[PDB]
Amino acid sequence: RAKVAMSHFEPHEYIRYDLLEKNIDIVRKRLNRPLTLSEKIVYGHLDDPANQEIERGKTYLRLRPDRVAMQDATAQMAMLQFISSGLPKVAVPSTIHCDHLIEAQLGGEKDLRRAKDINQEVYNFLATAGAKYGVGFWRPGSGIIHQIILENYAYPGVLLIGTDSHTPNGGGLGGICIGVGGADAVDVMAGIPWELKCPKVIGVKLTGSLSGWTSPKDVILKVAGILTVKGGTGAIVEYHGPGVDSISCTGMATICNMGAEIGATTSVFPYNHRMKKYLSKTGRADIANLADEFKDHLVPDPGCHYDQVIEINLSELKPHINGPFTPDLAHPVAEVGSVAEKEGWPLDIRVGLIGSCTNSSYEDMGRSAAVAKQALAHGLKCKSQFTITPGSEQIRATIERDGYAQVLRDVGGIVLANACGPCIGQWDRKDIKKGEKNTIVTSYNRNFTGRNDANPETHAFVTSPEIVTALAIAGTLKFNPETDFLTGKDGKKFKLEAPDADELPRAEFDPGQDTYQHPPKDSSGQRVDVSPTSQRLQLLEPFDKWDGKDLEDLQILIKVKGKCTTDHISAAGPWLKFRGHLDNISNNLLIGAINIENRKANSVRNAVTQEFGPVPDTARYYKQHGIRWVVIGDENYGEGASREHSALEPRHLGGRAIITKSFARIHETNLKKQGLLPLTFADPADYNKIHPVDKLTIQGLKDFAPGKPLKCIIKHPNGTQETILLNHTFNETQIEWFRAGSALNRMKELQQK
């Protein structure tokens, strides 16, 4: 047995490739067919590979992830529920990353110092719960959860789960890294099997070589536009083909990260040479040597069947830019001027922002600085404001040492703390008025409803960092840098050459400042106290147990039109301050959803009083009056971000079922976790038969069984009614979370509590 440790922080926790192969060959003697790469890593982590029913898109796989990662906006509710198990130690290597609460205001040092004082109480809670239950803690300044994971924790054939929808970034180093809600991270930290609907697999055949201004980001901007935000739901994405090798490991992580935007369970690349080189450059040459020894198990089987296959010729791919309000509205940088024209999107760029976990790598900063260098060499600074987020303290230390940070500061860039920042709305934007229509281009992933600054009128376009830099220099979406000229301060016209930069540093990466804090899981001792009077942290009161009766005469709180993402159900930005307090954060419930009745966000009719008002207040008014209610939704309800708050908040305010045409995968699992009923119309045209006024009866809950639809009676005000059927994807363990009131309660009742 090789004794090669998972990371430099867990010397004693070894990679189990032996276990993986054992289970793969068990499964493969039962399936007798080629396995894809995500099927080898996923079925190789099955708790029972000899008896697990394995069928794509149909069965619930009982799995054993190798490790759990949390970030600080979703770690507070995950540790509060983990304290409730009363387990004294986590069962797997687990980390907390403090990246989500640092607000971009004046730039890195100022900002991080501001945030450590602003967020003391929360950072203290998370460090102390981390020391107490054996969770490694990365302090504010460490970096964005996914960078730190790529540099320290992802490896070939890992199964990692993270409480973030962009955990898929770790597929850049051949692991299966899946985003989940905090209650799923609590399963694995408490030792209980994690279940995952068995994934379908989309294969993206890559061909050719990326050239010029075209970078890895453009491969996923292209696949998102092709497949749409709904195209990857319930599937893992597998890249393969000759083109794979032309992409660096952090470029493969960029392509896997924004796979989240098509609803994919996760994305992965096969173990290869550029992965090997990235491991070695990060002090993990030993993991790369063991991976070489099991590479048989870390690449797809010849002839493996993909459910969908898409092909991309990398050498014909052009620079793209997606937006302004969906990540799947794709444009070549070439024609984006004209479309903004036709469609009335602002052509002047207010702010260009490079960073986020999607595009904050050393290679990313290197190509951004290569573009900035040329502009600087002609006496130019940025026309648009320009912000730069480094992905980790190591990348800030190294780009500082290798001079990228001074070039980018010299064209007028502000380099922010190594934190999410403007990406989740942790931004004190001061250059517009609220409501001012404007355009910002970013090298981020998502571009929902100005969610960068809380201005619904901000038009955000996602692109590659080097195109963000050429466009912040030019100030307008009319600039295509592959073909347009700029005028130096010397009155001479020049065109920007395509960037070229080092994938990795020549020397060692400079680690920067000390930000890791290992659990003294020696003595431990110190207790985590949360103030009975905190406005930011509150202990979770157990949700109520099911009374065993039907859901009769349900009031419709809202019938939502169109796109209802978790940023519509539970916004971030000024709400991240309450990610540890459920009653305070429940005050954003669905304030962004569009009411079909009047097509307004946060204006629903209260049915007792007949006044139109805040969706949060109406839900508390129905709860205080004993009126149980339902949300009716459209398609891909709950798209986007991972936050289990979008499911904790409707349960907390009296919610009972969310009936939709379809759900996003993580949100639907979060709804089952919190004792709500996610249900879908057996016929989606029945959405059209429910009017905001109807009362609805969900009958047959005494007979709730796997694969059997429920009856819904739509009670119309004129006394007519009509019965429809509702399908559900509950298996018997999720039906027991329902009966008990939540999965947490089901655990406490199994724990003879």
Ligand X SMILES: [O]/O=C(/[O])[C]([O])[C]([C]C([O])=O)C([O])=O
- Write out the H or E segment, with its range, that includes residue 370: helix 362-376
Q: Which two tokens stand for residue 444?
A: 């981020």
Q: Tell whether residue 420 is among the known ligand binding residues.
A: yes
> Among residues 392 and 595, whose Cβ is nearest to ligand SF4?
392
Which residue lies nearer to ligand X by CB, 210 or 571?
A: 571
Nearest to 164 by CA among 79, 75, 77, 81: 75
d(CA 540, CA 358): 33
Distance between CA atoms of 201 and 307, rounded to whole angstroms? 5
- Min separation Cβ 26 and ligand SF4, Å: 36
Tell me 414's DSSP state: E
List all residues 6 or more positions away from 129 whose beta carbon is below 8 Å from its beta carbon. Answer: 79, 82, 83, 135, 528
Q: Should residue 250 be labelled a site residue for ligand SF4 when binding is judged by CB under 6 A?
A: no
Among ligand SF4, ligand X, none, residue 144 binds (CB under 5-8 Å by kind)? ligand SF4
Q: Is 165 annotated as a binding residue?
A: yes
CA 706, CA 727: separation in Å to the nearest integer? 10
Q: Where are the beta strands (DSSP E) in 432-546?
A: 438-442, 458-462, 485-487, 493-495, 516-517
CB of 603 to ligand SF4, least distance (A): 28
Residue 680: phi, psi to the nearest 5? -130, 150
Task: Based on the shown chain and the rule CB under 6 A, indicate whether residue 101 belongs to the binding site for ligand SF4.
Answer: no
Residue 179 or 263: which CB sits closer to ligand X? 179
Q: Are 651 and 674 in contact (CB under 8 A)?
A: yes
Q: Residue 502 Cβ, how far from ligand SF4 at the closest point, in Å?
A: 23
Beta carbons of 507 and 398 less than 8 angstroms apart: no
Q: Residue 313 corresponds to which tokens in the numbers above?
A: 């010729």
- Count of residues binding ligand SF4 (CB under 6 A)? 10
In the list ligand X, ligand SF4, none, the entry touching 356 (Cβ below 5 to 8 angstroms by class) is ligand SF4
Residue nearest ligand X by beta-carbon distance: 642
Query: What tokens were used for 424?
Result: 């989740």
Minimum separation from the CB atom of position 697 to ligand SF4 (A): 40
The verdict on whether residue 164 carries a ligand-binding annotation is yes
Q: Token digits for 520?
A: 């003294």
Binding-residue pattern over the window 633 to 672 for ligand SF4, x denoting contact by CB under 6 A:
----------------------------------------
Q: Any binding-site annotation on 570?
A: no
Amino acid at 76: Q
In order of 34, 176, 244, 268, 317, the CA distances from 311 in angstroms are 20, 22, 12, 16, 11
What residues between 117 and 146 interact with ligand SF4 by CB under 6 A? 144-145
Helix or strand or coil: residue 248? coil
Q: Between residues 178 and 424, which has the closer beta carbon with respect to ligand X?
A: 424
Of residues 164 and 187, the one with the C-beta less far from ligand SF4: 164
- The answer to the question of residue 424 lying near ligand SF4 (CB under 6 A) is yes
Distance, CA of 507 to CA of 671 (rounded, Å): 48
Q: Which residues bind ligand X (CB under 6 A)?
A: 73-74, 100, 164-166, 179, 424, 572, 641-643
Q: Does 747 bind ligand SF4 (CB under 6 A)?
A: no
Single residue of 370, 420, 554, 696 touching ligand SF4 by CB under 6 A: 420
Binder to ligand SF4 among 94, 445, 565, 729 (CB under 6 A)?
445
- Closest listed residue to residue 501, CA positions, set 732, 672, 708, 250: 250
Give the nearest distance from C-beta 231 to ligand X in angstroms.
Answer: 18
Q: How far apart are CA 168 and CA 160, in angstroms?
A: 9
Considering only residues 103, 164, 184, 694, which one is a binding residue for ligand SF4 as defined by CB under 6 A? 164
16 is in an annotated binding site: no
Residue 420 or 440: the one with the smaller Cβ distance to ligand SF4 is 420
Span 333-372, contacts to ligand SF4 by CB under 6 A: 356-357
Cβ of residue 397: shortest distance to ligand X, in angstroms? 24
Q: Which of 90, 416, 423, 701 binds ligand SF4 (CB under 6 A)?
A: 423
Six-digit token string for 533: 């009077």
Question: Binding of ligand SF4 at residue 440 (CB under 6 A)?
Answer: no
Helix H or strand E segment including 238: strand 235-240
Helices (H), 266-335: 273-281, 285-293
643 is in an annotated binding site: yes
Task: Summarize the annotated binding site as residue ranges.
Answer: 71, 164-166, 357, 420, 423, 446, 451, 579, 642-643
Write out the residues near ligand SF4 by the rule CB under 6 A: 144-145, 164, 166, 356-357, 420, 423-424, 445
Task: Summarize the annotated binding site for substrate as residue ranges.
Answer: 71, 164-166, 446, 451, 579, 642-643
